[model samples]
Target: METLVQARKRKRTSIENRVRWSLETMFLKCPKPSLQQITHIANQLGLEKDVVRVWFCNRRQKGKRSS
Candidate 1:
């Protein structure tokens, strides 16, 4: 079984700049993404569904708290 530390490290190993850019664009258009939109975005980006959802949630949170 994989340890939690190893699992977390593996998950953070890499990300695509283009995908990050695109997600940023999507955030610009829709900070609160719908369920269908989440699925579609995840599929289109070839990323885990929860990952895309969490990004939107966190993005919206931080955007509101910015100084």
Candidate 2:
């Protein structure tokens, strides 16, 4: 069994990989991939679906000015 911190670290790594892969693939295909599409890609990459979803949400918020 993994410790909670270890599990979270692994999960974060997987999420980052999934997000990068999804973004690259979507850019190559020239489409705005939906959250479902990202989640599916994450699943295919063996990541937790919700982690991928949150990654996408967080990534989209990056580099933006706050209101």
Candidate 3:
């Protein structure tokens, strides 16, 4: 069994990969990707839909500041 710290680390890694994939998909195909499409991609990557949603939302909000 994994320790709490190990579980947290794994979750973070998963989220990081999901975020990177989402960004890549958004960059390669659509400038404004939808939550449903991101969720589907995240699901295929074995990540939670909510995490994908949060990552996209945060990324968009951050983008508004610089561009």
The per-prediction tally of clashing pairs is 0, 0, 0
Q: List the residue pairs that clash in candidate 3.
A: none
Tens digits of per-residue lDDT, candidate 1, 1-67, equal 6554656322543346567568778768855667778777776677787677676676668656667
Give model 3's TM-score versus the native structure. 0.52
Shift in Å, residue 13, candidate 3: 6.3
- The count of residue-pair clashes in candidate 2 stands at 0
* Model 3 Cα lDDT, one tens digit per residue, 7-28: 5434754566555665656645
CA lDDT of every candidate:
0.66, 0.60, 0.62
- Give the TM-scores of the predictions, in the order they appear: 0.59, 0.47, 0.52
The number of clashing residue pairs in model 1 is 0
- The residue ranges of model 3 lying beyond 4 angstroms of the native Cα positions read 5-13, 16-28, 65-67
Task: Provide the lDDT at 60 for model 1.
Answer: 67
In candidate 2, what are the lDDT values of residues 1-67, reduced to their tens digit?
Answer: 5555655445554456555666555635734776567666766666766655665576567656677
